Amino acid sequence: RMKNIGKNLHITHFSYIMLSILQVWNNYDYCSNLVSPDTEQLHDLIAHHAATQSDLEFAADHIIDTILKKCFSNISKYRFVFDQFVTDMTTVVTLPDWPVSDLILARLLKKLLSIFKHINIESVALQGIGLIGSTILDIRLSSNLIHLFNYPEDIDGLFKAYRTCLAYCTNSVQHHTPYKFLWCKQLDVLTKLKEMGSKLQQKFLSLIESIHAVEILPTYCSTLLTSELINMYEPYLKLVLSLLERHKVKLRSGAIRCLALLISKDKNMLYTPIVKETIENRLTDSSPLVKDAILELIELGSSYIDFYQHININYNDDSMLVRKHVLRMNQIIYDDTEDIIIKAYVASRILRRIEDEEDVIIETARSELLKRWILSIQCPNAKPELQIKNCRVSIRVIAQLLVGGDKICDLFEHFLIFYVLNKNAHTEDQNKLISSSLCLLTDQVIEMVIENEEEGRNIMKFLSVLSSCQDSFITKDHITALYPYLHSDSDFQLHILKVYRNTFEQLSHFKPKFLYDLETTILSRLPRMNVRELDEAIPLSWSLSRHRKDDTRICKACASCLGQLSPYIANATTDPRPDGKLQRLLYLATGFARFCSFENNLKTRENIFEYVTKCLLMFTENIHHVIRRIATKNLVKIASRYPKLFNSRHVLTVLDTQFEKGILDIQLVVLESLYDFFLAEERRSLISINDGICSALVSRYLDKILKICLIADLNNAMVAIRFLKQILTYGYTNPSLCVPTVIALTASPNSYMRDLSSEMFSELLQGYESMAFNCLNQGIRLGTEYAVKIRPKQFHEDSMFLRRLQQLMSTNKRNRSKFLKVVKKTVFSNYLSTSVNYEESCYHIIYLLHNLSKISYDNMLELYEMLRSVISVSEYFSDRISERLDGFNTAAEVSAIIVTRLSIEEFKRFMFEQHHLSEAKLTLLDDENLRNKSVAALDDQVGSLHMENIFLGYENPINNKDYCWKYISTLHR
C-alpha cells in the first residue's frame, strides 16, 4: 500500500499524509488579508511565523524520534520501514509539491549523525545517511544565505526563482497548501537574515504586496541552497571521512560506499581541501585493504595526476595487491600528464618493479614501458609527424629518468640490454618493430643534441647508454655530425667520448680525412684530460690508429708524454715533490701502456709497457705520499694487463711493502686494483687465462687480506671481504682458510658485513658442511676478539652471535650436538683454562658468557652439566683470589680474575632466574642424569646479563686498586 504521485512515484501513505498535515503550518492567510503596511503589525507577523516554525520543528523532531526509536528497538524486522522512510523523503525533496520535506530530512540527518550503539544500527544509519548526502549533492549540482548577507542584490533574484515554483504549483494536482507553505519559505529567508534594517523591510513589504517538470528542478533547487539541509553537507562530509579510521570494518566499508557515490557525481570533489587531506593521510597510515580502497576512490575521478606523489608512497608496499594497484595508476598518470618531470617520476617507479617477488608484476612493468617507449613509435595508426613527436617525449622522459640514481640507471640498462634487445623475449614481429623503433629513436636522439647546440647533457648520457649496446644504431653520418661538439666544452665530454669509443669499435670504413682531423683533435687534448675521460680517449686513439692503418701519430703523442717525465725520473734518482702535472702524466703514461700495443719511439730499445713500469717503480718510500699512491695504483693496473709482471721481484716487493706498512689509502688502492684483476680473470674463464699467477698471489697475500677483513676501517674491510668472496667462489684456496674469518664477520655490529657474512657462510655450509664444523672453533675465537675490538665499551649489546650460528648449523640429529660440543670445548679449552692470561681475555670471556646465555642447550642435562662446569671454574678462581689477599703491582691479575669470576657468577644467576632453576638438581649426580636428558629447552630475549654485578660501577676495573678493594670488602663483610 503506497500512494501515487505525478511521475510514477509512490510513497508510504504514512509519509504522504504526514507531509500534507505539516504543510498547513503556514502563515500566508495571515499575510494575504494583511493590506496596510503597519510597521507595527509586521514585527507582529514575525512572532507568529517564528511560532509556526519552532512548533513544526518540534513536531518534526518528535515524529523523527518515534520512528527511529521504533526502528532501532528491533533492528532485525523494521529494516525497510526505515529505508522506506528515507527513500520517501529523498524522493520528494526535489519537488515543489512537498516543500516541508527539506525540513524533515534536515532533522533526520541531524539525529543519524549523532549516532556516530550496536553495529547493526550504525551500519543501517550509515547507509541511509549516505543516501541523504547523495541527494544533498544532487540538489547542489542542479544549478547560500550567508552569501545573501554580503550581497543582498541576489535576494531579488532568489524570490524570482520562488515565483516560478509557485507558478508551477498552481497547475496540479491538489496544490493549495503546497503553494502556501512554499510561499512562506520566502518569508522564512528574511527572518533568518534579520537573525544575523529597512532594506529587508521594503523587500518584506513588496512581498506582501505581490499576493495581488524537469525544467523547474534546476530553479527550485536554487531556492533550496538557503535551507538548513544543504548547509549540513560539510559536517556530514567531515564525518564519513573520519569513519575511514574506525576499527570496525562495516563502518569503514560503509564510508567507502558513501564517498564512491559522491565522487562519481562530482569528480572535482577529490581536490576539495577536506577530502584531499584525509585521502593523503590514509595512504600513509593504514592497512593494505584500506590503502587499496582509497586508491580505488581516487580512480573514480577523471584525472588524478596531482595525487601522483602520494600514490607512490606504496609503490613498494608489502602487499602484492597494493603494488599491482599503484603500477596500474602510474600507467594512467603517465598517459595523462604532458609534464616530463611527472612522467619520469612515475616511470621510475614502474621501472623499479621489474625487480619484484611476483613474476606477474615484472612482466606488467616491463611490457608497459616497452609499449610506451619503443613499440609506440611505429603505431599502425600513422601519421609520421606525430610519430617523431612521441619519439621525442620518450627521449625527454628517459633522459630525465637517467638523471639521478645509480640504481635506476642500472635498472634501465638491464631493461634495455637483457629485455628490449633480447630477441628471445619477444615475437618475430615485435623484434622487427623494436629494431625499427630504436633505429628511428637513436637518430632523433642525435638530432636533439645538435639542435640543442639541463636537457641537452642528459640526452647525451642516454646516447652513451644506447652506444654501449651490442649493435647500436649510430652510424657514420651520426658520428660525423657530432664532431663539432667534441671540440666545444661538465660530463658532456666524457659521454661523447664514450659514444665515439664504442661506435669506432663497431663501425668501419670511415673517410680518411675525417679520421685524420679526429685523430688530431683527440691527441691534442689528451694532456688536459682527467683520468675517467683518458680511459675512453686512449682506447679511442688506438681504434683510430687501426682505422688509419697508421701508428706514427699515436706514437708521437706517446713519446711526447714519456719525454715530459724525464725531468721527474731524474729528480727521482735524487729526491725532494709533486703538484698537478705529474699526477695526470703518470695516468697518461700508464694509459698508453695498457691500451696500446705498439712495439719499438726514440730512447732505448724495449717494450713500452716494460719501460713504463720501470718509470713507475721509480715512484713506488722516499717519494711523496700522494704520488706513491697514484704510482702504486697504476703499477697494479699495468700488471693486470700483463700478468707476467706479477712474477717480477721488483713489483712483488712493492706489494709486500704496502701490505705490511699498513697505510690505509695505499693499501686500499692495491686491494681494489688486485680485486679488479681477479674479477677480470673470471670473465675470461667464461669465454687468456693465467691460474698459476693468481694462485701465486693468493698464497702470499691471503693471510694479510684475511686480516684486513677484521680491521676497524670499513673502507678497506669492505673491499677485502668482497675480494675474499671472489677468491672462494673461483676456488683458488681450500675453503677452510677463509671460514674462520667469515664466521668472525657474522659477529659484526655493522649491518652489511653481518648480512654478507651469513649468506657466504650459508653458501659454504651447503657446499662444505663437515669442513665448516672443523673451522667453528677458530671462527668463534676470531669472532669474539673482533666483536670486542670494534666496540670496546659496548660489545656486550649483541648476545646472539653464537645463536645465529647455531640456527645456521644445527639442522640435523648429529649437527645439533656437534655445535654444542665445539662451543663447550672452545669456552673451556681456550678461555677458562690455566694457559689463559685473564688480563688479555676477561672481556672476551664476558662477550662469550652473554652469547652462551642465548644459545639452546637442547636438553636440561647439557644445560645443567654446563653450570656444573662454570661453578667449578668459579670456585677455582675464588681459591686463587683467596691466595692473594692471604698475603696482602699485582692488582692487574687479581682484577682480571675478579672480573672473570663475577662474570661467571652473573651468568649462573641469570641462567637460574630465566630458566628454572634449582640448586637441588644441580648439586646431585648420577638415572637422575638421564632424567635430565629427556627434558627440553630453548631461549629468547628476555633481557641480558646485569653488568652492574660485574664491574661494580667501576670504569675500567682492570688494574684498579679501588675495584679490588670493593670486591674484598664484599668478602670479609
Numbering used by the authors: 423 to 538, 544 to 570, 577 to 629, 637 to 652, 663 to 903, 913 to 948, 951 to 1037, 1041 to 1064, ...
What does the study report here?
The cohesin complex (Smc1, Smc3, Scc1 and Scc3) safeguards genome integrity by ensuring correct sister-chromatid segregation during mitosis and meiosis. The topological entrapment of chromosomes by cohesin is catalysed by the cohesin–loader complex Scc2–Scc4. Functional studies have revealed that the in-vitro-loading activity of Scc2–Scc4 resides in the C terminus of Scc2, in contrast, Scc4 is likely a chromatin adaptor for targeting cohesin in vivo. To gain further insight into the molecular function of the cohesion–loader Scc2–Scc4, which has such broad implications for both chromosome biology and genetic diseases, we determined the large modular structure of C-terminal Scc2 and derived a pseudo-atomic structure of the full-length Scc2–Scc4 complex.
